[PDB]
Design a protein around this ligand. Structure first.
Ligand SMILES: *[C@@]1(=O)[C]([O])[N][C][C][C][C][C][C][C][C]([O])[N][C]([C][C]C2=[C][C]=[C][C]=[C]2)C(=O)N2[C][C][C][C]2C(=O)[N][C]1[C][C][C][N]C([N])=[N+]
Lengths: 10, 29, 252
């Protein structure tokens, strides 16, 4: 239920 | 940045205390 | 954290979340000791019995967080790791002796109201504060109960317990690289670190210069908030030389 992190971090 | 280490911007730096830090200090007899 | 309270905004600005890239999930707590170095438990990265062996690419560090789950859009800063350093004598085989690791960020983080490093104890600071009966503070987003998860960062103040009492509460062989904390069954107050809190900081506030110091790392326990049991923590000052060492040789 973790909210999505910005792809820029992946 | 350890130099300014352990002084919180919203507490130490403004001379504000958090809700339970006195329980800590009152234990260091 | 078991029997804690929600932390106030900016109460623990050195609090770090260890975050798995995929599945995205919370791994452990950690702490910010400078603009490029993070301190955590070696077990958060390497624990062969459980097939745990995380690499740099496997993870993200999240700093300035409050909420466990939301991406805190202009507050938290996410970083990638440049390199992981585990204590060469970490003992995963028997007792988690020397449970400590350093992580150097790819790029130095900027300090803010919610992002600020904790101090590393000196010989003298260690000597006056690491006393049975003296309270330290633990923080993390771990389980609220042994058996769920907080919405926000939790905190609990707990007393350091005498070495004998620590030793006699368990079957595991305790080393000088560890200390235990918690209230005694008669003491009538509770609280402990619980699953999800590992690698986080045990800190104390100096009464001499009134700065926060990190004395321990959440390391191991048996259950959470059980009577006659205590949480164990890596003794940060005892491993200070290895810490100093790696920073002098590899970064800063
Ligand atoms: C921390 O959140 C975690 O770091 N990683 C997940 C581990 C939870 C699994 C539960 C299983 C039991 C167990 O083996 N617990 C040990 C207890 C004693 C021990 C065994 C072997 C060697 C040394 C010690 C244990 O706690 N751990 C084994 C590996 C890592 C560690 C651990 O589970 N840490 C937890 C934090 C727990 C804090 N608990 C507490 N303060 N009551």
């Amino acid at each position: 239920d973790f909210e999505e992190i910005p792809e820029e971090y992946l | 940045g350890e130099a300014d280490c352990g002084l919180r911007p919203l507490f130490e730096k403004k001379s504000l205390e958090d809700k339970t830090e006195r329980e800590l200090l009152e234990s260091y007899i | 954290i078991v029997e804690g309270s929600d932390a106030e905004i900016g109460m623990s600005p050195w609090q770090v979340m260890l975050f798995r890239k995929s599945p995205q999930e919370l791994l452990c707590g950690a702490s910010l000791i400078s603009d490029r170095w993070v301190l955590t438990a070696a077990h958060c990265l390497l624990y062969p019995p459980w097939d745990k062996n995380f690499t740099e690419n496997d993870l993200l560090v999240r700093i300035g967080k409050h909420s466990r789950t939301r991406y805190e859009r202009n507050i938290e800063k996410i970083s990638m790791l440049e390199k992981i350093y585990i204590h060469p004598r970490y003992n995963w085989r028997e007792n988690l002796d020397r449970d400590i690791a350093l992580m150097k960020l790819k790029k130095p983080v900027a300090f803010s109201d919610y992002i600020h490093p904790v101090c590393l104890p000196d010989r003298e600071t260690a000597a006056s504060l690491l006393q049975a009966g003296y309270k330290g503070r633990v923080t993390g987003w771990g389980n609220l109960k042994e058996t769920g998860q907080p919405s926000v960062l939790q905190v609990v103040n707990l007393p350091i317990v005498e070495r004998p009492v620590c030793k006699d509460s368990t079957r595991i062989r305790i080393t000088d690289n560890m200390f235990c904390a918690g209230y005694k069954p008669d003491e009538g107050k509770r609280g402990d670190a619980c699953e999800g809190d590992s690698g986080g900081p045990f800190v104390m506030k100096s009464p001499f210069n009134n700065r926060w110091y990190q004395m321990g790392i959440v390391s191991w326990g048996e259950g959470c908030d059980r009577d006659g049991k205590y949480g164990f923590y890596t003794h940060v000052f005892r491993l200070k030389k290895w810490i100093q060492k790696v920073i002098d040789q590899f970064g800063e």
